[PDB]
Subunit: 555 residues, 3 copies
Amino acid sequence: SWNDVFQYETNKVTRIQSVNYGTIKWILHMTVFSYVSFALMSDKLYQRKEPLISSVHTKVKGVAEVTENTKLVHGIFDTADYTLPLQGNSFFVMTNYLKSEGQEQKLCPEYPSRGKQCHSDQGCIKGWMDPQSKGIQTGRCIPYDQKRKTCEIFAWCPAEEGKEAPRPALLRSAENFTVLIKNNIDFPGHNYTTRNILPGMNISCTFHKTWNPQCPIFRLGDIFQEIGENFTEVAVQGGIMGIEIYWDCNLDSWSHRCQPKYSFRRLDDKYTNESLFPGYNFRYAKYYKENGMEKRTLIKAFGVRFDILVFGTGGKFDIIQLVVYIGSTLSYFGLATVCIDLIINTYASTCCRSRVYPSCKCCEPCAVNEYYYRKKCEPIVEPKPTLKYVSFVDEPHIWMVDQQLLGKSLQDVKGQEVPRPQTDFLELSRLDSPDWCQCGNCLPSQLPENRRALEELCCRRKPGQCITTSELFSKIVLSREALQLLLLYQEPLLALEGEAINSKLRHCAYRSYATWRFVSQDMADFAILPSCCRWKIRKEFPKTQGQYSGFKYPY
Amino acid sequence: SWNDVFQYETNKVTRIQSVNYGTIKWILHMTVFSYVSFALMSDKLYQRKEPLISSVHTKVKGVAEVTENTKLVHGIFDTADYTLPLQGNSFFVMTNYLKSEGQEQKLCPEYPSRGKQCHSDQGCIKGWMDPQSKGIQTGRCIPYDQKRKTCEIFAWCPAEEGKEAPRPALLRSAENFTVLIKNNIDFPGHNYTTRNILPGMNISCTFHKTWNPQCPIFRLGDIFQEIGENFTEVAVQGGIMGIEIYWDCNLDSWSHRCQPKYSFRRLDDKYTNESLFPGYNFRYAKYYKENGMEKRTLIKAFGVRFDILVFGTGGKFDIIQLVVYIGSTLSYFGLATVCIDLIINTYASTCCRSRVYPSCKCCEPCAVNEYYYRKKCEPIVEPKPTLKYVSFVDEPHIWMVDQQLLGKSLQDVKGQEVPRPQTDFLELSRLDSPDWCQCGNCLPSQLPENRRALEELCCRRKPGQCITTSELFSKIVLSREALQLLLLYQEPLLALEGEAINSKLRHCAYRSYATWRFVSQDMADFAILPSCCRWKIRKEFPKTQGQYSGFKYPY
Amino acid sequence: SWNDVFQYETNKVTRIQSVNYGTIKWILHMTVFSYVSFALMSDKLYQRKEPLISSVHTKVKGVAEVTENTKLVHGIFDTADYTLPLQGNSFFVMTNYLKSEGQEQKLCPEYPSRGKQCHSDQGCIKGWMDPQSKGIQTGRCIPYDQKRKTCEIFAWCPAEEGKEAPRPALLRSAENFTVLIKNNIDFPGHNYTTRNILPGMNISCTFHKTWNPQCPIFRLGDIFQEIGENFTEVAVQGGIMGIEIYWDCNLDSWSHRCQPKYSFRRLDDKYTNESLFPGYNFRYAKYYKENGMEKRTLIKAFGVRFDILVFGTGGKFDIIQLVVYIGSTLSYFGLATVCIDLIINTYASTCCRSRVYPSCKCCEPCAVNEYYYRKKCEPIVEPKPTLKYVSFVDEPHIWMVDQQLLGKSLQDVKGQEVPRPQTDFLELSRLDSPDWCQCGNCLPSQLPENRRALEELCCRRKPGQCITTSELFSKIVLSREALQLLLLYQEPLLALEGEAINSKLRHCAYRSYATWRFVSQDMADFAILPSCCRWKIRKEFPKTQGQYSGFKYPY
Ligand SMILES: Nc1nc2c(ncn2[C@@H]2O[C@H](COP(=O)(O)OP(=O)(O)O)[C@@H](O)[C@H]2O)c(=O)[nH]1
Ligand SMILES: Nc1nc2c(ncn2[C@@H]2O[C@H](COP(=O)(O)OP(=O)(O)O)[C@@H](O)[C@H]2O)c(=O)[nH]1
Ligand SMILES: Nc1nc2c(ncn2[C@@H]2O[C@H](COP(=O)(O)OP(=O)(O)O)[C@@H](O)[C@H]2O)c(=O)[nH]1
Ligand SMILES: CN1C(=O)CC[C@H]1C(=O)NCc1cccc(C(F)(F)F)c1Cl
Ligand SMILES: CN1C(=O)CC[C@H]1C(=O)NCc1cccc(C(F)(F)F)c1Cl
Ligand SMILES: CN1C(=O)CC[C@H]1C(=O)NCc1cccc(C(F)(F)F)c1Cl
Ligand SMILES: *[C@@H]1O[C@H](CO)[C@@H](O)[C@H](O)[C@H]1NC(C)=O
Ligand SMILES: *[C@@H]1O[C@H](CO)[C@@H](O)[C@H](O)[C@H]1NC(C)=O
Ligand SMILES: *[C@@H]1O[C@H](CO)[C@@H](O)[C@H](O)[C@H]1NC(C)=O
Ligand SMILES: *[C@@H]1O[C@H](CO)[C@@H](O)[C@H](O)[C@H]1NC(C)=O
Ligand SMILES: *[C@@H]1O[C@H](CO)[C@@H](O)[C@H](O)[C@H]1NC(C)=O
Ligand SMILES: *[C@@H]1O[C@H](CO)[C@@H](O)[C@H](O)[C@H]1NC(C)=O
Ligand code: NA
Ligand SMILES: [Zn+2]
Ligand SMILES: [Zn+2]
Ligand SMILES: [Zn+2]
Ligand SMILES: [Zn+2]
Ligand SMILES: [Zn+2]
Ligand SMILES: [Zn+2]
C-alpha cells in the first residue's frame, strides 16, 4: 500500500561508445536548440503582445488665394474655409469647389450633363425622383438655353449638378499646406502610454523618410510625392489618402523601444468607374434668410480626405507565454533519439547485407547496427494456447507452430522458422514405426484422438538416427542422478521415495530436454517433446496407475 | 573526457508480437493524427493571423418631398439637406424633424411637456438651469396659452423642447434612399490590400443576401427588412443601425480568398426607457442675421445613424506557427504507449486472477500480461544497511527484513514475503540448542550483544532436520574442491596455502550458500546465513587467531 | 509482413522501492500539475478570446449663461450652441470662445501677437502666406492702433488671430454638464452582444468609482477630479480627455460575466510647447448675407474633446485551445524522471567516493546510486575491426586496444583499462623465448609480417609462471572431453572424426579461454589469445596441412 506510492521507474538503457552516433546526436540537439532560440527571439514568443488604443489630434496650417468669377471675385481661404471642425482620425482639406449661390426651392431646368437632354415633354417622367438631378420631375421638357432643353424639376434652383470639376483645381496651393499630427497611444494591459512628440523635438522640422522620419509635421504635397502620387491631378476630383502610423513597441526595460513609423497609402481607387463617384467630394449647404425668403448656397467641395490609421502592438515579457513555448518545443529534442533508433533498426535488417552491402561497400561498416539492435530489443511473442515450438535434430533452427491442429499431425505442419539463442557459453564453460516417424523409436499417442496430433511429432524431419542414441540424452535427460541433484537444489530436503519422485523426475527430464534443445525458457515452456524422447523418459520413470496428461498450457 | 561526449543512450525495449496491442497502437496513432490534422486545417493554426485596417467611404443617393405647414410649405430635401459632411465609418440620414424658426435669446414660457405645468410663481425655481427645457428659470409662472401656464425661462424663444416627434415621419421616403459603401482594407503585416469593389461589377445592382451578396449598394428599407425591422416606425424617433462587413481573408496563393460578407444589426435598444432618450436625434442650429439681430432656426432632427463596422483577419502561412503547433501536439502520440503500458501493468496484478477472472471468463486470455510485465519490469529495492534476506528450508519463499533489530532475534522477526527467482535452468542443466533454533545445530553468536540478533537465525521456522544434513550442502558449501575450483576460475594462479586460502574458502562458501538459497545476487549480497550453516562452514575452515566479523554492509 | 504491423514495443524499466525518489517524483509531478492548472485557469488558456466591435451614442445635457461684451450682451448656450452634431466615439464640449463678428474678405492690419509688430513697409513681405495671421501680406506696415503698427494682409477682417483665450473661461459651468454614454458591444465570432445599460438601472444616478461604478451618466467636473485634473484651468485653452470602457467579458455559461469598467485619462500633453498648439481648439465659421455682401462670424472655440475608447475581449471555451495547451504542457511532466536520472548518473560516478564523500559524510548514503546505475545502463562499445581485448594473469582487469597495430607488438601497446564482469556466480555454483614474452612458452607468430603484431602477446606483463601451468587451463581449454561435451550439446549427433572435429575443438578451446578470461561474450568475441595458450591449443589439436588464419573480425 504505502510502498506502492514510494516507487520510481527508470528506463533501462544501452549506451553506445560510438563517435558517429554521438556526433549526430549533438549536432541535432544543437540544431533544434538554435532554431528554437532563434524563433523565440525573432518572434518574441516570450512576450505577451497587446494592441494599442490611439487618439489623434490634427492641426492644419495654410492659406489659399483664389481669383474666380459675372465679376472677378477675389477670395481668401483659411482653415475655417476649407476644413471641417472634425480633427480626429480623419481630416478633410478642400482642393476644388463648384459654387451655386442663391438657391431657392422652386422649378427649374436640370443641368445638361452626360446626355441629359430631352426633345419632348412626354419623354421626361412626372413625379420621378432623380438622385442625379436631385429634383422631382414635372413631366415637361423646358429650354435650359437657346440650343438645348432639359426636363423641368422641383429642386434647389439654379441647379448645377453634373457640372464637371474645374480644371486646374482652384485650391492647388493646398499642396503647400502642412498638418501637425499628435498621436497618443496606450497599451492598457501593459499599463503603458506614450505619444509621437517628445521633449526636445525640432519645431521647424518637416517630415522626411530619411532626414526627419520622426517629425510629425507633414506637407501634403510631400505626402503625395513620397508614394508617386500627383497632387495637382488628384486635387481636381479629390481622393482619400491614408497616413499609417505603426507602433512596433517593445516595453521590456532592457530592450525598451516604442517609436512610431510613418507611411502613406492611397485609399481610393485610381481607376474607379465614372458611375461609382470617382474621387472624393461632398455637398456643403449654407442657409441664409434674404428679405423674407430662405436661400441656400451649395458648395460641391472636392478634396483629399486624410485618414490617419494607427496600429501596432506592445510586447512585454510574460512567464506563462515563455513556459508554453518551451513546453511546445521540448518534444523536438527527441529528434536525435528518433533518427538514431531508426538508423539502428533499419541497418539491423538482413536485407541490407544480402542486397545493399554487395552493391555499395561504403555502407558496409554499418553492419554493427545488428549488434546494437540485438543489445537493444528483446522480441517476444504472445503466449497463446496454440503456441508450439518444435526442434529437429537434423535441422539447426526451431519452428513455431502457433496454428490450431485440426487433425493434421504436428510433424506434417510446417510453422515458421526461428533462430536458436546462444546457450550461455559462460554457464556452459564447465565439464513398424508410425508413418510420421523418421527415427524408429516413436510410438502412437495415448491421448484422445481430438488432441492426438500434438504428440505426433518425431525428433527429425528425415530418416536417420534418433536423438536418444546420443550419450548427452542419457546424461541430461535420463540421468537419475542429475535430475535428483536438480530437485535437491530446488528442494534440499526432498524425499526420494514414492511415485511423487517419479513424477518430479519425469517433469525435470521434460524441462531438461526443452532447455537443451530450445535454450530460452520462453520457447522451452511452449516446446513439444518428440514422441521417442517423451516415451523414453516415461519408460525411465513410468507412471504406475495413471494416464499421462501431456503438454499443458501454462496460462 | 572526449569519449564522454561521443556517447549515445538508447532505451532497452521489448517488442510484443501481439495482434491486439499492435491494432490498438495503430488505431490510437491514426486517431491522434486525424484529430491533429483536422484541427490544424480547420483552425488554420499554420497561419499567422492579422487584423485589418479599414477605410470606409459612403455616398448617399435620394431625394425627398415634404408638404408641411400658418401656410402650406412645399419642401425639397437632397443629400445636403439630410446628410452631414461626414462620410466615413458612420453616416446619418434624417427621417423626421421638428422646426423652430426665428429663435431669439430672450424670455418665454417653456413648452408644456409631460406635466411641466405650474400653478404659481413660487412653484417654479429662479436661476435653476433645466437641461430639459434648455433655459434658465426666472421664478415666474406665465401663461403658455389660454388654458395652461408654464414657468418663464431665458432661452432661445419660441421654445418647443419636449414636443413629440411628428407621426408619421415626414421623410418616410428615406426608405427608398440608397447608399454606396467603398471599403478599403489592408493587412499591413502581410503587405496586402484590397477593396470591396473590383472591376467588372454591376453598377445597377442592389444588395441582396442571395442574388447579389457582393453588391455594395444598399437600400435602407431593404437593410431594415433583412433583419425584421420596420423602417416606418423607426423613422419617427430614429435609431442606430450597424452594417457589419466581415473579412475572413486567406492570403495563401493556393487558397487565396479575401471577400467581404455583409450583415446588419440594430444597435440601439428597442425598449429604451423614455427618460434615457429613446431613438436617435440631435439638434441642428442655423444662425442668421435679420435686420440687426442674431436669430437661430433650431432643427430637432430624428434619423437613423448607420455605423459601418469593418472587422476581420488575414491569415498567411508561417513556419514558426506550424512548428509550434506540431511541437505542442507531438506529445499526444504517446497515448498508445501510455494506454498499452497501463493495460499491461493492470492485468499483471494477481487481484484479477483471484477475483475478476472467475467472475468473468472473457477477460481470462489477458493473463498473458503477467508474462509481458515480467519481461518488461525488473523490481529492485533500496540497498540500505537494514536490508536483510532470510530463507527457511521448510518455507518455499524468502523474507525481507528491512527493519532495525532492536534486540529481538532475527528468527522472531517476520519481515515481508518475496518470491524466489528461477535458478537459470539453462545454467542448471548440468550434472541444549538455543531457544530460537529448530534444527539442533545452531550455536549462540560470538558478536557483541548490541548486534547479536543478526546471527540469531535458524535454517527453519519449525522443528525438523537441518539443511546441513542434505548432501547438496556438502557438495556446494563444504566441498573444498569446488571452492578451490571457483577461486582458481577467478584467480588461476592462486596460492592454496596459509590462512588466506581458508578465509577465501569461507567467503566462497558463504557466497555459494547465499546463491543456492536466494538465487539472485541482489538478494544474496544481503542474505543472512543461518547459525548452523555459518558455524559448519567456519568449522570446515576455522580462523586460527581471529574473531569473525560476520555480515558486512556492501555499501 | 502482416506480423510486422502487429507489433508493440514497450520500454524495459527498473522500478526502485526508494522513499526519497518516489517522494521527489510525486512532489515534482504535483508542482508541475499545480502550475499548469493555475496558468490555465488564471490566463483562461482554454478560452478562445475575441475582440469586440463597439458602437457609442452620447447625449450631453447642460445649459450655460454668459454675460460678455461695446454693449453688455447676455447669452444662453444650449447643446446646439456648444456641441457638434457628431455623437459617436468622440464628442466636443465648448468651454471658451473668441468671437470675431462681421468679417469681410479685404485688407486689414494683422493682430499684434507675440512680437508681430513692424517698423517699416519693406520689413513685411509681399505675397507671403502666413498661416499664423491667416492672410496674404501686401508688403506694407500699417497702424493697427495709435502706438503699434502691423503688416497689412488680405484676409477676413477684422483679424483677431493670436488673441489669448479669455481667462477665466466663459463656459466654466460646463463642469456641471452631464453626458450619458450608451455602449453596444458585440463579439461577432462568439455570437454575443450586450450593452452598458440594462433594465432596472437607476436613471437619477451619477457615476462614481465606488458608489455607482455602473452608472453611464458622467459629470465632466467629476471626470476631471477623478484623475486629479483641474477643469477650470483646462477650460481656458481646452484639451482632450479619454473615457476608457474596458470589457473583460467571460461568455461561459457557468462563469458568465460581461460588465464594463469605466476609467479616465488625459490624452493631451499638459506641457506642450507653445508653438505646438497647446490645448484643443478649432475655428467655426458662420456665413451670412448682409444687404448684398457675404460676411463671416468666426468663433475660435476652445474646449474639451471627449474620446470614448472602448476595448476588451470575450473568452469562450474552445476544445482546440485546451488541447493545444495540454499538449504544450505535457512534456513538463518528465521533469521528475530527468532530475532523478541525473541524480542517479551523477552519484554513480567514482569521483564522489574519492573526494566528495570523505569531505561530507551526509552525502554518503547516496552511494546506492551506483547499484541503480549498474542496474539501469549497460555500456557497450562500437565493434570496429581495430577492437581488441587483452587480459594478463598478473593484472586483475582487461585492456581494450582499439588502435591500429602499426608494427608495434600488441604486448607493448597499453590500451585503456576496463573492469572484468562478474562470472555469473549462479551458473558458477557447480563443481630462447621472444623478447615480448614473459612466460617462456610463447612462440613467434606464423602470420604475415604486416599483421604479426596481433599475435605478439604474452599471458602476463611481468616474468612469472605461464597461465597454462594452471590445472584449470587443461580442465577448461585442453580437456578433449569437455570440448566434445560442449559440441554435442550444440550438435547432439556430431561426428567425432576427421580434421573437422579437430578444428571444431580448437575453436571451442579458443572460445572457452576467451569466456574464462573475459567473461562477457561481447569482450570475448574481440579478445586476443596469448601466443602460449594459442600454440598449446594448436599443439593439442594440430592442423594437418593448413595455415592458421588467426583472429577474424566477426563483422
Ligand atoms: N513443454 C512440454 N511440456 C510437457 C510435454 N509433455 C508433458 N509436459 C509437461 O509435463 C506435465 C505433464 O506430465 P505427464 O507425464 O505428461 O503427465 P502426468 O504423469 O499426469 O503428470 C505438464 O505440466 C506439461 O507441462 C511436452 O511435450 N512439452
Ligand atoms: N550475506 C552474508 N554474508 C556474510 C555472512 N557472514 C559473513 N558474511 C561475509 O563474510 C565476510 C566476513 O567473513 P567472516 O568469516 O564472518 O569474518 P572474517 O573471518 O573476519 O573474515 C563479510 O565480508 C561478509 O560480507 C552472512 O550471514 N550473510
Ligand atoms: N577471440 C579470438 N579468436 C580467435 C583467436 N585466434 C583464432 N580465433 C578464432 O578462430 C578462428 C580461426 O581458427 P585458427 O585455428 O586460428 O585458424 P584455422 O585453423 O584456419 O581455422 C577464427 O574464426 C577466429 O575468430 C584469438 O586470438 N582470439
Ligand atoms: C467656397 N468658399 C467661399 O467662397 C468662401 C469660403 C468658402 C466656403 O464657402 N467655405 C465653407 C466651409 C467651411 C468649413 C469646411 C468646408 C469644407 F467642405 F470644404 F470641408 C467648407 Cl466648404
Ligand atoms: C428641415 N429643412 C428645411 O426646411 C430645409 C432643408 C432642411 C434643413 O434645414 N437642413 C439642414 C441640414 C444639413 C445637413 C445635415 C442635416 C442633418 F441634421 F439632418 F444631419 C441638416 Cl438638418
Ligand atoms: C459663441 N456663441 C454665440 O454667441 C451664440 C451661440 C454660440 C455659437 O456661435 N455657436 C455655434 C456652434 C454650434 C455647434 C457647435 C459649436 C462648437 F464649435 F463649439 F463645437 C458651435 Cl461654436
Ligand atoms: C508652393 O510654394 C512654393 C514656394 O513658395 C511655390 O513656388 C509654389 O508655386 C507653391 N505651390 C502652389 C501650388 O502655389
Ligand atoms: C500632374 O497633374 C497636372 C495636371 O493634371 C499635370 O499638369 C502635371 O504634368 C502632372 N505631373 C506629373 C508628374 O504627372
Ligand atoms: C418607394 O418607391 C416606391 C416605388 O416608386 C413607392 O411605391 C413607395 O411609395 C416609395 N416609398 C415611400 C415611403 O414613398
Ligand atoms: C410599420 O410601422 C408603421 C407605422 O408605425 C405601421 O403603419 C406599419 O403597419 C408597420 N409595419 C409592420 C410590418 O409592423
Ligand atoms: C455647479 O453647480 C453648483 C450647484 O448648483 C454651483 O454651486 C457651482 O457654482 C456650479 N459651477 C459653476 C462653474 O458654475
Ligand atoms: C484650478 O484653476 C483655477 C483657474 O486656473 C484656479 O483658480 C484654481 O485654484 C485651480 N484649482 C486647483 C485645485 O488647482
Ligand atoms: Na511534448
Ligand atoms: Zn521417431
Ligand atoms: Zn527419435
Ligand atoms: Zn538451528
Ligand atoms: Zn540448521
Ligand atoms: Zn609468454
Ligand atoms: Zn604464457
